[PDB]
């Protein structure tokens, strides 16, 4: 059976400025089948306040979802998105890098 | 709005 790996991107809605409210996004796209676990992490811990978009797919049938939460960046706090899917042999963690 | 005419395969 076809399986396609999620492409994971972690980023903020607006350019990050410490002490200023923003949104943290984890976008996963290009995957198949649709069963996927996605968590946003703060300092390695799962964030509970997390919403996601409704499951949809692209022209090649691969799925996409956006997971998101309001957040206020600081110097010290580290953010990440943890993703598991049948194509991944262990959960994959992608760290938020604000200097891209 | 949605269609009608959607039949089983």
């Amino acid at each position: 059976m076809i399986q396609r790996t999620p492409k994971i991107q972690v980023y903020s809605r607006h350019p990050a400025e410490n002490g200023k409210s923003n949104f943290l996004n984890c976008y996963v796209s290009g995957f198949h089948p649709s069963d996927i676990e996605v968590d946003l992490l703060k300092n390695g811990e799962r964030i509970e306040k997390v919403e996601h978009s409704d499951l949809s797919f692209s022209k090649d049938w691969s799925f996409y979802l956006l997971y998101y939460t309001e957040f206020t960046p600081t110097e010290k706090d580290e953010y990440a998105c943890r993703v598991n899917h049948v194509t991944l042999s262990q959960p994959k963690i992608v760290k938020w890098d604000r200097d891209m | 709005a949605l269609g009608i005419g959607i039949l089983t395969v």
């Binding site: 076809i2 980023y11 976008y27 796209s29 409704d54 949809s56 799925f63 998101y68 | -």
Partner: protein
């Protein structure tokens, strides 16, 4: 100037864990406006854009009725497809359907589509004439014969060329603020050393709508396709999109590299430079 309405449906079986999961979403262009989730409490088609909220109770009742009918058909499909492919119940399987219409700048019908996939692969689709079918393998030929004998294409064509276009126009007018806008990308490039001899150059486009955009790198005017990392266009979550493309270059060569941005919101394509 051009526009589309598309509906996307996904049904997934879950062996011994009850009924299949069914999710339907509707978009105008890159803006979602409705959803239905079979697992949710409401059991209603629900609004997901401000401008659809004004539709009255008849719209929501009828859309809920229709989406539940679609749900039931896909439920039956998952059993039929397992029989067509001689598959067991040890595993989960996925049906997807997508359909809709495109119009040009003048809001006149361009083309229609109605496509079905099973386990991530094309299964059957209406051809561009909306009068015939493309069946991807032998099981889909069985569906083709049945859908020809039942005159399915004629019903679909009437919708895609007529009804679909009429609702799209209605939505475009009611949601004009959101839907008939164009937000040009705000662009810049970033530079970061990866060592004493190489740097990553990343070309950014932010805050744009609609999502369609092209970002490319050139070196002395020559395209750098095979050396470019291009990420998938991603939602900002506010109704706009972002995208970047990067190349890793020898330090000192930055001035040879240019980023090129094309978007319908730009009066002219942009070239960004390091000099």
């Amino acid at each position: 100037g051009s526009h589309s309405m598309r509906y996307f449906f996904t049904s997934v079986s879950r062996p011994g864990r009850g009924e299949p999961r069914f999710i339907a979403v509707g978009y105008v262009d890159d803006t979602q406006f409705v959803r239905f989730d079979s697992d949710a409490a409401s059991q209603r088609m629900e609004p997901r854009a401000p401008w659809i909220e004004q539709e009255g109770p008849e719209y929501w009742d009828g859309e809920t009725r229709k989406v539940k009918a679609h749900s039931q058909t896909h439920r039956v499909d998952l059993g039929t497809l397992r029989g067509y492919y001689n598959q067991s119940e040890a595993g989960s399987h996925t049906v997807q359907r997508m359909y809709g219409c495109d119009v040009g700048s003048d809001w006149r019908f361009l083309r229609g589509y109605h496509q079905y996939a099973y386990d991530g692969k094309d299964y059957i689709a209406l051809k561009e004439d909306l009068r015939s079918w493309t069946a991807a393998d032998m099981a889909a030929q069985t569906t083709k014969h049945k859908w020809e004998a039942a005159h399915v294409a004629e019903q679909l064509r009437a919708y895609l060329e007529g009804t679909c276009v009429e609702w799209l126009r209605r939505y475009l007018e009611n949601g004009k603020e959101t839907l008939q806008r164009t937000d040009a990308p705000k662009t810049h490039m970033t530079h970061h050393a990866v060592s004493d001899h190489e740097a990553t150059l990343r070309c950014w486009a932010l805050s744009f709508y609609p999502a369609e955009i092209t970002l490319t790198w050139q070196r002395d005017g020559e395209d750098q396709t095979q050396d470019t990392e291009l990420v998938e266009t991603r939602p900002a979550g506010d109704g706009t999109f972002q995208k970047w493309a990067a190349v890793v270059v020898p330090s000192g060569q930055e001035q040879r590299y240019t980023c090129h941005v094309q978007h319908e919101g730009l009066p002219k394509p942009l070239t960004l430079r390091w000099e």
